[PDB]
């Protein structure tokens, strides 16, 4: 067994301490492990997120406008875990999919079936007005060419969208694929427990002061390091088990599962946070289907 | 005689502190008092700018890129400036119209007759590589719709140049002929002397540290404060005869002219700053061919 003790979990990007190179063949490598994993990893980033803006409390009263909404799921947990702490949030779900029926007759929802553009982006801000947006972007169109455009659009709903903060989709292009250096929004770095055994993905969480917007510069060489940094995170740290870790489950996704629910509010008073998190990851098990 | 007593003139557009209706009438009124002002005023503001750089040890070594170059016929004096303080730069001018033949026949300048688009930008990013790169935009399409092509234009020169410092062109849309909210780079807004008697435009001026860069979102509310400020710069300040400013000129554009002037770096040594700045502004106005 591959045992191990730590202290904490790396929580962002910046955090990891070692790289390996790329190796190709974890391509072909099972990439999940639970069902429906990817609602999974949605669920615990967005809670992570979400509270965090809580905390500053620049949550309730706000409209959080989620684009690449659909199917879902695990949109309507988060939903419910606000709703029923007293947070008043208005949810405005938009994907040219359909979403999960689950979703639908909350008057505190409203679900639309449409994929955006910059045009339409300014239409929703204009009626939106003059409500704090928070705002989550999934979209997917991938080739890099697919993802530049993909980011491209991210950083049109910033600045039409003009939100109070926001969480993006962030996977850096290979280095082999390179096409041309590009700007993302300065944000942290937040990494995704149950994200797939080989994903590169993390989320771009970032609170916006002021009038200002401060983007950062991405190059082939830091796309380099995203790949080896993540490549060693992949490879060798989620596949320990954190013997240290007194919980029903040592395995490091749950370690990091943890940390980020210890970070969550709840109505119910615990005596520990193991109690807590327990608590919170048995609902959201239970909530998924999840065995 | 509207006489007056001032410590300093203003420097920035945010020390301006005060503000008048602007009056369309002013637009019926003489623009310009000096020939070749319009050379003077680029002239002021880009050694000033060129003379901070030098202060912060940025410009030795550096390429200038200068897009919207010609005529030029000012930038012969600043290339003949810092040539003979011993300061090494390669002048780039790019502009579609045809640059003052002055400016031929120095192996530091390259002149290139075509007017830049983002493709271009890229093909001379690779060309001028790997030098630092210092940016200079004057590019003039105006509509609202003119001049906003024209910020994203500076904006994309950035992005893809990269430089370590740039000094673009700001005007502020009318108030009264706002299209859209827009983001410009993050820097200070230079105020000019000798501008046209009633122009609202100053100079960006912006020193990148790291890899971010920082944009700030300019709204319709913001362009009525430009509009105020700068007409009551324009209509009452500039105006004024500094009385207890002792220079053979007391109007008000040579006393900030002179504030300008203070900074510039001489290989002569003066007795006082006063004989410096004479010096200077003798040289520049016998250059120009003004009285
Ligand atoms: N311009 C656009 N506007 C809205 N949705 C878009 C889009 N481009 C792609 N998408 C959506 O991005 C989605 C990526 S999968 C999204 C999963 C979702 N976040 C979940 O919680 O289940 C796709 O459904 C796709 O239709
Ligand atoms: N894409 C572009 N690339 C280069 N020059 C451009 C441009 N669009 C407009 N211009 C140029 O912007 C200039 C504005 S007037 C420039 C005056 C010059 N800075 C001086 O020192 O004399 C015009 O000459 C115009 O041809
Ligand atoms: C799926 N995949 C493809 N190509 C790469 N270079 C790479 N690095 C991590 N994952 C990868
Ligand atoms: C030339 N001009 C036209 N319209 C305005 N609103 C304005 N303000 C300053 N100058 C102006």
């Given at each position: 067994m591959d045992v191990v003790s730590l202290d904490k979990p790396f929580m962002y990007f910046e955090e990891i301490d070692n790289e390996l190179d790329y190796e190709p063949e974890s391509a072909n490598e099972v990439a999940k492990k639970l069902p429906y994993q990817?609602?999974?990893?949605?669920?615990?980033?967005?809670?992570?997120?979400?509270?965090?803006?809580?905390?500053?409390?620049?949550?309730?009263?706000?409209?959080?406008?989620?684009?690449?909404?659909?199917?879902?799921?695990?949109?309507?947990?988060?939903?419910?875990?606000?709703?029923?702490?007293?947070?008043?949030?208005?949810?405005?779900?938009?994907?040219?999919?359909?979403?999960?029926?689950?979703?639908?007759?909350?008057?505190?929802?409203?679900?639309?079936?449409?994929?955006?553009?910059?045009?339409?982006?300014?239409?929703?801000?204009?009626?939106?007005?003059?409500?704090?947006?928070?705002?989550?972007?999934?979209?997917?169109s991938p080739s890099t060419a697919d993802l530049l455009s993909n980011y491209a659009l991210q950083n049109v709903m910033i600045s039409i969208l003009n939100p109070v903060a926001s969480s993006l989709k962030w996977r850096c292009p290979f280095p082999d694929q390179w096409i041309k250096d590009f700007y993302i929004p300065h944000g942290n770095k937040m990494l995704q427990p149950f994200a797939p055994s080989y994903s590169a993905e993390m989320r771009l969480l970032s609170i916006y002061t002021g009038e200002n917007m401060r983007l950062t510069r991405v190059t082939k060489s830091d796309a380099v390091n995203y790949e080896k940094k993540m490549y060693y995170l992949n490879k060798i740290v989620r596949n320990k088990v954190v013997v240290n870790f007194d919980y029903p489950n040592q395995e490091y996704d749950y370690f990091h599962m943890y940390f980020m629910l210890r970070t969550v509010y709840c109505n119910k008073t615990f005596p520990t946070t193991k109690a807590k998190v327990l608590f919170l990851q048995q609902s959201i098990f239970r909530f998924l289907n999840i065995p």
């Open positions: 990817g609602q999974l990893k949605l669920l615990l980033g967005e809670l992570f997120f979400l509270s965090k803006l809580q905390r500053h409390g620049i949550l309730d009263g706000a409209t959080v406008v989620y684009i690449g909404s659909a199917p879902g799921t695990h949109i309507r947990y988060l939903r419910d875990h606000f709703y029923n702490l007293g947070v008043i949030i208005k949810w405005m779900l938009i994907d040219g999919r359909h979403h999960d029926p689950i979703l639908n007759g909350l008057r505190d929802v409203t679900l639309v079936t449409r994929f955006v553009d910059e045009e339409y982006l300014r239409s929703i801000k204009k009626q939106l007005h003059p409500s704090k947006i928070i705002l989550i972007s999934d979209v997917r």
